[PDB]
Design a protein around this ligand. Structure first.
Ligand SMILES: Nc1ncnc2c1ncn2[C@@H]1O[C@H](Cn2cc(CCCCC[C@@H]3SC[C@@H]4NC(=O)N[C@@H]43)nn2)[C@@H](O)[C@H]1O
Length: 262
């Protein structure tokens, strides 16, 4: 469209690689299958990917969690993956890492949209929402010693292109979205949260809770088989899992698409 310039690999490099960030390497590609895929294939080849950033202008076979698939239109989103060395950390709290990316995405964009912050938060465990619409999705995938973190931020996507519940920074009150300034600020907020995660900083758990749309509301979790538990989400436990109050007693749950029911 008219509002979708391409990126600048050079600018990003100079702002981030060694200078204003801890990231070691940065590549923009015009088209791949899945940025997660590429960084996994690359680690399985023997390459160290701790610190590597991969950004794509367009992505064709997008990966969602639990099987499903993410959809993209050329230059309309910010689509990236990054590599982190994890084996220095308990194998609990690895799920707390995909959570952490959620916060890095709500932080980077919160100072840009002019919607009441109280109507923006994080849906557990891998969605980001602004007035009911899906703003970005996150996927963490494992390949020890590394984790690969994928973000898909709808910058200028329109909903009638990838999903009817999507919205975007454009549709939220942003006339010119600067994908270079947004990508650069999000890579910084990522780096900040990952270090919190590695040093078991408890500010990570508290801030997630503060900005959760899931916590504090009746929710519904749909499980394979036609199963459905319904409860109020009281807290996240230390593995990154969802504590529910059901008839007074805690049911912990690992994943599932959660449905907010106010
Ligand atoms: N553009 C869009 N905007 C709004 N909503 C959308 C949409 N495209 C699909 N959906 C709806 O998402 C549902 C399927 N889903 C979404 C997620 C969340 C995590 C997404 C991971 C993507 C990143 S991108 C960089 C990296 N590289 C990858 O390969 N994967 C990662 N997990 N599963 C399905 O129901 C659809 O309705």
């Amino acid at each position: 469209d008219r509002l979708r310039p391409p990126l600048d690999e050079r600018s990003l490099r100079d702002q981030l690689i060694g200078a204003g960030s801890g990231w070691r390497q940065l590549d923009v590609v015009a088209q791949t299958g899945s940025t997660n895929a590429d960084l996994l294939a690359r680690a399985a080849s023997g390459a160290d990917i701790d610190g590597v950033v991969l950004i794509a202008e367009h992505q064709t076979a997008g990966r969602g969690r639990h099987g499903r698939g993410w959809a993209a239109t050329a230059r309309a989103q910010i689509i990236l993956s990054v590599g982190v060395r994890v084996v220095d950390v308990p194998v609990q709290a690895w799920g707390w890492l995909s959570l952490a990316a959620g916060l890095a995405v709500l932080d980077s964009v919160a100072p840009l949209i002019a919607v009441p912050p109280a109507e923006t938060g994080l849906k557990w465990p891998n969605d980001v929402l602004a007035r009911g619409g899906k703003l970005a999705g996150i996927l963490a995938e494992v390949a020890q010693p590394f984790v690969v973190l994928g973000v898909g931020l709808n910058v200028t996507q329109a909903p009638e292109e990838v999903d009817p519940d999507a919205t975007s920074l454009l549709d939220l009150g942003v006339a010119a979205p600067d994908r270079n300034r947004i990508a650069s600020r999000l890579l910084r907020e990522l780096e900040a949260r990952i270090i919190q995660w590695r040093n078991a900083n408890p500010q990570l758990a508290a801030d997630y809770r503060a900005r959760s749309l899931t916590i504090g509301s009746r929710v519904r979790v749909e499980l394979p088989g036609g199963q459905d538990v319904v409860g109020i989400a009281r807290d996240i436990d230390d593995q990154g899992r969802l504590c529910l109050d059901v008839g007074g007693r805690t049911v912990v749950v690992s994943a599932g698409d959660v449905v907010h029911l106010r």
